[PDB]
Amino acid sequence: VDGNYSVASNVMVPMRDGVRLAVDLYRPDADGPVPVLLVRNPYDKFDVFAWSTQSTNWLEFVRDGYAVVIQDTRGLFASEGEFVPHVDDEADAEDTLSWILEQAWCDGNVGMFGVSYLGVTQWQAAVSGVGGLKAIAPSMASADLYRAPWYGPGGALSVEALLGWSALIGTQLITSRSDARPEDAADFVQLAAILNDVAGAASVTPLAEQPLLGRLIPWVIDQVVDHPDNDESWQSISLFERLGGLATPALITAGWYDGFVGESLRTFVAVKDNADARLVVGPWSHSNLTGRNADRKFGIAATYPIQEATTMHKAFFDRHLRGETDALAGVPKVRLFVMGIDEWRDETDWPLPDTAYTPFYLGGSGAANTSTGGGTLSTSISGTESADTYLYDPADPVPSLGGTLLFHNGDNGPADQRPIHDRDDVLCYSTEVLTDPVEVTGTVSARLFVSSSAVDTDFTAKLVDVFPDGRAIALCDGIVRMRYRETLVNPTLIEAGEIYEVAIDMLATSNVFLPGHRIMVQVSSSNFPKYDRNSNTGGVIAREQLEEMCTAVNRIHRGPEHPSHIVLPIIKRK
Amino acid sequence: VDGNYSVASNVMVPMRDGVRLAVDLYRPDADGPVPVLLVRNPYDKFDVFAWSTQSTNWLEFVRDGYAVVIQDTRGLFASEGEFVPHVDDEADAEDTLSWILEQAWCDGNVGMFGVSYLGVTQWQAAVSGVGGLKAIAPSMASADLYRAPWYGPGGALSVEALLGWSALIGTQLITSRSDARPEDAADFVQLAAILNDVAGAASVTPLAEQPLLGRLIPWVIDQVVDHPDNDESWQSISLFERLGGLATPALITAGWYDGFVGESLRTFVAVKDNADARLVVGPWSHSNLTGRNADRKFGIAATYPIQEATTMHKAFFDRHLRGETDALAGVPKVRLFVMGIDEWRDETDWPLPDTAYTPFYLGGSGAANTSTGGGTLSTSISGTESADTYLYDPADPVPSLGGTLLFHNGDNGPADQRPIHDRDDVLCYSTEVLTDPVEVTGTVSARLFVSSSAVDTDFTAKLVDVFPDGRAIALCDGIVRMRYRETLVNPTLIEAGEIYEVAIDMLATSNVFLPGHRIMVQVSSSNFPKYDRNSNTGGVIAREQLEEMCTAVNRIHRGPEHPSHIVLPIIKRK
Ligand SMILES: *C1(O)O[C@H](CS)[C@@H](CS)O1
Ligand SMILES: *C1(O)O[C@H](CS)[C@@H](CS)O1
Ligand SMILES: [Cl-]
Ligand SMILES: [Cl-]
Ligand SMILES: [Cl-]
Ligand SMILES: [Cl-]
Ligand SMILES: [Cl-]
Ligand SMILES: [Cl-]
Ligand SMILES: [Cl-]
Ligand SMILES: [Cl-]
Ligand SMILES: [Cl-]
Ligand SMILES: [Cl-]
Ligand SMILES: [Cl-]
Ligand SMILES: [Cl-]
Ligand SMILES: [Cl-]
Ligand SMILES: [Cl-]
Ligand SMILES: [Cl-]
Ligand SMILES: [Cl-]
């Protein structure tokens, strides 16, 4: 009967190596075989409520005649084997899709959907080149684990994401015990303490000393902390280079304040020429999809639109798994929540056609130190050669406030930056108050002329919308670790005192700066614990004691010969 | 097979009047009949993800061999008939339980669980005295709809809750159309605008003029706005007086910042002598169960503990529907999240045994106006007869900040009160800085000696924890509408200038005021839009234009002959 279904629990699926992963089968009451959707989950396939609110009302897929298979990843919950993040997911996904394709209830069409880790696993599945996989729908995900979520395009560790997540997995590994242990109760306590104070956990030096996390999940040190360079161990798990060879349709969701935003958007650009790719980007952080934050409310239309998302996914799967060639009629290619005007808007492509990548140059009379300095932004090159100078002290890094934080206060993306505006290592440059709106929608970067007294250091750039009432709301930001200025692969040190031109990848945003606002950029050398703190030594940063680290006199050069700027993706619609 | 189940959609269940309500059946694969759990839902039985995250992982009940029935209430989504809130729910619940009891797959034991409206409906079901109903689990609910959520023990309208909710129902009635209409698109827009600005919608005078909401849901005016008195129309739907005659076990959940908190706790006290009642109270608001707020973080243990809740519910139902007499071994009678120390704690009863209901008297040199006045709180009666005086102007009411707000900024319960501390109509009284902790856990009220130049006005009282850093965090609050000082049923006006002793029911809290903090009480005559604004005329408030309203010179009397105080439920544990 239409609308009706059954659920079978703990169906054991054998992988190539004989290890068995558990799945749940949600199968419609059907005459013959049906199209199937697979979800690969490390947070317990039974616990559907935990993730699904960030995704789709997918029981609608089942009522509409799709089968849905939810799987425990290797070594977790009801699955056999050992869990190590990422390393087994290509093969296990391949083996699982094959098994599904071989079932009596599968009609030869398979798709995938899901958020975060349930999104990363879809890219890992799509590179298997299993013919029967017809579409994927990776939400808030990445195809390059170095670039998101563990490190970044800047070559700094996303330490708060690392320790926060490891503590969560740790908690699970315990609560899911094969056989309970005496140290479980106390370990649980230590894990909660990390999660109540991720900045605290990130502050212990040497960073590589993680007695609890290293014991529960050795990968935290063995893979992540020990591999600062984007090396073979990372390229081994990266999917990105293989994406351009695929012809798999992908429905891709991202959030402007989501740790994955940069990589999510990159995946869209990589697949769009070869297959039907779609893009939806709302003003969300990884853990806050509500549209509401402490100092910024985006309106009820900003709340993750779960029902519209369900409808969109269903049309997408109807088109690619069912061959319904008109199923996506009237569905936009790209749908963005444009902040400022706080409205959803349809677009034909990402990057937007008719993006004007426009330099806004750093300038001003006197020092740009603090928000009350004389720092300016202007579309004209500055007339006079100047330099802003500050001391970066690793023992006092600039605290993280909003942006793309994941586990350390990850629920306030558009955070008011005022609490750090009186600090001497936070350089501020702003336009005059705008009398006409300025829309910035696209990828954002800065080109800075910099110098240090140290042989390595960081430089950060942050785009900020300054409201009439004084709120200085964060939009997007990035970091460059100077040893990685040229490459994430073969780092080299710098000469103290030499001026370098460096690029800062500031990810992406969509914001209209309305009349009465200002475009503002904050420049510094730290952003902790979003990123780990540079020791200013040129050493193996994660192996250094705080005491071993050095302060740095860092300098931003600006003027005719050193035209430091932010490149803004200007959109003009009249 | 154990763990396995099937789901049948849109099974139509006939009521006594021939109208049919739709249900979904989640039935385990079972030899014979099983115990059954019923959930009555006005937000679409299909949409399980919307509410369940506030409740339980109840698929675990189904995997463990319970059937679960989820029903669309009369006139919504897949059900037939006309929707009017509350009025049909006693009979429909009765008819539905009977139908379930008659099914081949029902073993004669029925239970219920659910949150909010899904909680209110359980009290409405429990008064039918259907023998087969063995237990209920009403979360964030009430058995007296006047007292929560529509009015309150003070006799003021909960206007923000009223309009916010009506707009939500309105939105549903549209999105669920039998036959789509030309005005749907525009109506949808107007509904969103109310929900983005509930304070704005609440500000239109006369309040009873609601062209959109009155048309979509006439009950908004016909029942709620038109019945300011706790009259026969309210008593008709109230369950409270019948609760003391029941012998139904009840697992009751509440939140310290939840609009229903006062009534949730009252239901526990009413059933505890006659049946196995349980209580769980976390630091949540109706729409924020995370434990995280703009200016107050309660720690990860405060996050609604959905898995522990599932386990507790399962043991509860195992005990009462399955007759497993040891199923609740080691489960506490009462479990409270004690704020301040920010820890869960078990207790044997609510109110706590060894509560010392202790007067803290208003005093001080000079006026108590603003936070920089000389207002004090002390366990000693004030020595000298004084009075604090302010003007209450309905056109400028004291704005609502946290507390038990539902739809107008209902996600910041423990709000910092500082933004209203310089106001002249906000009287502030505080203890000295504490050097030893003071625990306040229980029902809270104030006894004030008051006078007005008006023949009716409001008086509000708010309990506040003042932190070392200056944060003035709201805990609990209430209001008395003076015409209802003696009774909610037969209001009478007051004499301008006469001193009255009035009670303010300030609901309940659990907080340890730690060393370095202060106990603080804010007194005023408005709290908008949590409550509607008194017009100070003695008229039908909801029918008055702003222009028709009067200002009031209100006065709080304090001293030996007028010992105004807050009664605090002091707990002492050494
Ligand atoms: C998702 O499930 O949360 C994590 C944030 S770091 C991420 C890990 S790949 O996946
Ligand atoms: C719940 O579902 O939300 C409402 C808050 S006013 C309440 C109405 S009785 O039930
Ligand atoms: Cl089978
Ligand atoms: Cl393994
Ligand atoms: Cl805002
Ligand atoms: Cl919109
Ligand atoms: Cl354009
Ligand atoms: Cl200026
Ligand atoms: Cl110099
Ligand atoms: Cl140079
Ligand atoms: Cl049947
Ligand atoms: Cl009807
Ligand atoms: Cl706090
Ligand atoms: Cl605790
Ligand atoms: Cl006690
Ligand atoms: Cl004092
Ligand atoms: Cl006088
Ligand atoms: Cl008197």
Coordinates of C-alpha atoms in Angstrom, one line a residue, chain A residues 162-413:
Chain A
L162 CA 39.8 18.9 16.0
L163 CA 39.5 18.7 19.8
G164 CA 35.8 19.3 20.0
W165 CA 35.0 16.6 17.4
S166 CA 37.5 14.1 18.9
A167 CA 35.8 14.6 22.3
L168 CA 32.4 13.9 20.7
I169 CA 33.6 10.8 19.0
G170 CA 35.4 9.8 22.2
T171 CA 32.1 10.2 24.1
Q172 CA 30.4 7.9 21.6
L173 CA 33.1 5.2 21.6
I174 CA 32.4 5.1 25.4
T175 CA 28.5 5.2 25.4
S176 CA 28.6 2.6 22.7
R177 CA 30.7 0.0 24.6
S178 CA 31.1 -3.6 23.5
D179 CA 32.2 -4.3 27.1
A180 CA 32.0 -1.6 29.8
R181 CA 35.2 -0.4 31.5
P182 CA 36.1 1.0 35.0
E183 CA 37.6 4.2 33.4
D184 CA 34.5 5.0 31.4
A185 CA 32.8 7.1 34.1
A186 CA 35.9 9.3 34.6
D187 CA 36.7 9.5 30.9
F188 CA 33.2 10.7 30.3
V189 CA 33.8 13.5 32.8
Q190 CA 37.1 14.6 31.1
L191 CA 35.4 14.6 27.7
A192 CA 32.5 16.8 28.9
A193 CA 35.1 19.2 30.4
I194 CA 36.9 19.5 27.0
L195 CA 33.5 20.2 25.3
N196 CA 32.5 22.9 27.9
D197 CA 35.8 24.6 27.4
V198 CA 37.4 23.8 24.0
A199 CA 39.5 27.0 24.1
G200 CA 40.9 25.7 27.4
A201 CA 41.7 22.3 26.0
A202 CA 43.3 24.0 22.9
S203 CA 45.5 26.1 25.3
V204 CA 47.6 23.3 26.7
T205 CA 51.2 23.2 25.3
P206 CA 52.6 21.2 23.8
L207 CA 49.5 20.8 21.7
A208 CA 50.5 17.3 20.6
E209 CA 50.1 16.1 24.2
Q210 CA 46.6 14.8 24.4
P211 CA 46.6 12.0 27.0
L212 CA 42.8 11.4 27.0
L213 CA 42.1 12.1 23.3
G214 CA 45.3 10.4 22.0
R215 CA 44.4 7.2 24.0
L216 CA 40.7 7.1 22.8
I217 CA 41.4 8.2 19.3
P218 CA 45.2 8.0 18.4
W219 CA 44.4 9.5 14.9
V220 CA 44.0 12.9 16.6
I221 CA 47.8 13.0 17.0
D222 CA 48.9 10.3 14.5
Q223 CA 47.1 11.8 11.5
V224 CA 46.0 15.4 12.3
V225 CA 48.4 17.1 14.8
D226 CA 51.5 15.2 13.3
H227 CA 50.8 16.3 9.7
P228 CA 50.8 20.1 9.6
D229 CA 51.7 19.9 5.9
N230 CA 49.2 19.0 3.2
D231 CA 51.2 15.9 2.5
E232 CA 50.7 12.4 1.2
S233 CA 48.7 11.3 4.2
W234 CA 46.2 14.0 3.4
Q235 CA 46.2 13.6 -0.4
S236 CA 45.6 9.9 0.2
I237 CA 42.1 10.8 1.6
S238 CA 41.4 13.8 -0.5
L239 CA 38.8 13.4 -3.2
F240 CA 39.0 16.8 -4.9
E241 CA 41.3 16.0 -7.9
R242 CA 39.0 13.2 -8.9
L243 CA 35.8 15.4 -8.8
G244 CA 36.5 17.0 -12.2
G245 CA 36.4 13.5 -13.8
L246 CA 33.0 12.6 -12.4
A247 CA 29.7 13.1 -14.1
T248 CA 27.6 12.7 -10.9
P249 CA 24.7 15.1 -10.2
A250 CA 25.2 16.8 -6.8
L251 CA 22.8 18.8 -4.6
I252 CA 25.2 20.8 -2.5
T253 CA 24.2 22.7 0.7
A254 CA 26.5 25.2 2.6
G255 CA 26.2 27.8 5.3
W256 CA 28.0 31.2 5.3
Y257 CA 29.2 30.6 8.9
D258 CA 29.8 26.9 8.4
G259 CA 33.4 25.5 8.9
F260 CA 33.0 23.7 5.5
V261 CA 31.7 26.7 3.5
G262 CA 34.9 27.2 1.5
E263 CA 35.2 23.5 0.5
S264 CA 31.4 23.1 0.0
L265 CA 31.5 25.8 -2.6
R266 CA 34.6 24.5 -4.2
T267 CA 32.9 21.1 -4.8
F268 CA 30.0 22.9 -6.7
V269 CA 32.5 24.6 -9.0
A270 CA 34.4 21.3 -9.6
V271 CA 31.3 19.3 -10.6
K272 CA 29.1 22.0 -12.4
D273 CA 30.4 21.6 -15.9
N274 CA 30.1 17.7 -16.1
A275 CA 26.7 17.1 -14.3
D276 CA 23.6 18.7 -12.9
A277 CA 24.9 20.5 -9.8
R278 CA 22.7 22.5 -7.5
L279 CA 23.7 24.9 -4.7
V280 CA 21.8 26.2 -1.6
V281 CA 23.6 28.4 0.9
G282 CA 21.9 29.8 4.1
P283 CA 23.4 32.0 6.9
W284 CA 24.0 29.0 9.2
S285 CA 26.9 27.7 11.4
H286 CA 27.5 24.0 11.8
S287 CA 25.5 23.8 15.0
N288 CA 23.1 26.8 14.5
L289 CA 20.7 26.6 11.6
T290 CA 18.0 28.8 13.2
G291 CA 18.8 32.2 11.6
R292 CA 19.0 33.6 15.1
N293 CA 22.2 34.7 16.9
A294 CA 23.1 36.8 20.0
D295 CA 23.5 40.1 18.0
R296 CA 22.1 39.3 14.6
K297 CA 18.7 38.0 13.6
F298 CA 18.2 36.9 9.9
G299 CA 14.4 36.6 10.0
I300 CA 12.3 33.4 10.1
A301 CA 12.9 32.8 6.3
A302 CA 16.6 32.2 7.2
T303 CA 15.7 29.2 9.5
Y304 CA 16.9 26.0 7.7
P305 CA 13.9 25.4 5.4
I306 CA 13.6 21.7 6.0
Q307 CA 10.3 21.1 4.1
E308 CA 11.4 23.1 1.0
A309 CA 14.7 21.2 1.2
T310 CA 12.8 17.9 1.3
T311 CA 10.8 18.9 -1.8
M312 CA 14.0 20.0 -3.6
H313 CA 15.8 16.8 -2.8
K314 CA 12.8 14.7 -3.9
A315 CA 12.6 16.5 -7.3
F316 CA 16.4 16.1 -7.6
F317 CA 16.3 12.3 -7.0
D318 CA 13.1 12.0 -9.2
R319 CA 15.1 13.6 -12.0
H320 CA 18.2 11.5 -11.6
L321 CA 17.2 8.2 -10.1
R322 CA 13.7 7.9 -11.6
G323 CA 14.5 9.6 -15.0
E324 CA 11.6 12.1 -14.6
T325 CA 13.0 14.6 -17.1
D326 CA 10.8 17.6 -16.0
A327 CA 11.1 16.9 -12.2
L328 CA 13.4 20.0 -11.7
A329 CA 11.3 22.4 -13.8
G330 CA 11.3 25.9 -12.1
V331 CA 14.0 24.8 -9.5
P332 CA 16.9 27.3 -9.5
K333 CA 20.5 26.2 -10.2
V334 CA 21.7 28.3 -7.2
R335 CA 19.8 29.6 -4.2
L336 CA 21.5 31.9 -1.7
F337 CA 20.4 33.7 1.4
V338 CA 21.7 37.2 0.7
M339 CA 22.5 38.7 4.1
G340 CA 21.9 42.4 4.7
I341 CA 18.6 42.5 2.7
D342 CA 18.1 39.1 4.5
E343 CA 16.3 37.5 1.6
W344 CA 16.6 34.3 -0.4
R345 CA 17.6 34.9 -4.0
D346 CA 17.9 32.6 -7.1
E347 CA 20.9 32.7 -9.4
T348 CA 22.1 30.9 -12.5
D349 CA 25.7 30.1 -11.4
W350 CA 28.3 30.2 -8.6
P351 CA 30.4 32.4 -8.8
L352 CA 27.7 34.8 -9.9
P353 CA 28.1 36.0 -13.5
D354 CA 28.8 39.7 -13.4
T355 CA 31.0 39.5 -10.3
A356 CA 33.4 42.4 -10.3
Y357 CA 36.5 41.3 -8.3
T358 CA 37.3 44.7 -6.8
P359 CA 40.3 45.8 -4.8
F360 CA 39.6 47.9 -1.7
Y361 CA 42.9 49.4 -0.5
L362 CA 44.1 49.8 3.0
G363 CA 45.0 53.4 4.0
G364 CA 44.6 56.2 6.4
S365 CA 46.4 58.9 8.4
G366 CA 48.1 57.6 11.4
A367 CA 48.2 54.0 12.8
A368 CA 45.3 51.6 12.1
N369 CA 45.7 49.9 15.5
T370 CA 42.3 49.5 17.2
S371 CA 38.8 50.5 15.9
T372 CA 39.6 54.2 16.8
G373 CA 42.7 54.3 14.6
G374 CA 42.7 56.1 11.3
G375 CA 42.4 52.9 9.1
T376 CA 40.5 53.3 5.8
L377 CA 39.3 51.2 2.9
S378 CA 39.0 52.7 -0.5
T379 CA 38.7 51.7 -4.2
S380 CA 41.6 54.1 -4.8
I381 CA 45.3 53.2 -4.2
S382 CA 46.6 54.9 -1.2
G383 CA 48.8 58.0 -1.9
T384 CA 51.4 57.7 0.8
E385 CA 53.7 54.8 1.9
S386 CA 52.8 53.8 5.4
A387 CA 53.0 50.8 7.8
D388 CA 50.9 49.6 10.7
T389 CA 52.9 47.7 13.4
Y390 CA 51.9 45.6 16.3
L391 CA 53.2 42.9 18.6
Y392 CA 51.8 39.4 18.3
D393 CA 52.2 37.5 21.5
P394 CA 51.2 33.8 21.3
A395 CA 50.4 33.8 25.1
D396 CA 47.8 36.5 24.3
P397 CA 46.2 35.5 21.0
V398 CA 43.2 37.4 19.5
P399 CA 40.1 35.4 20.7
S400 CA 37.8 33.8 18.2
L401 CA 34.3 35.5 17.9
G402 CA 31.9 33.8 15.5
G403 CA 33.0 33.3 11.9
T404 CA 33.2 29.6 11.0
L405 CA 33.8 28.2 14.6
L406 CA 32.6 24.6 14.9
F407 CA 32.7 23.5 18.6
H408 CA 34.0 26.5 20.5
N409 CA 31.0 28.9 20.6
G410 CA 30.0 27.7 17.2
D411 CA 26.4 29.1 17.5
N412 CA 27.1 32.8 16.9
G413 CA 28.6 33.1 13.4

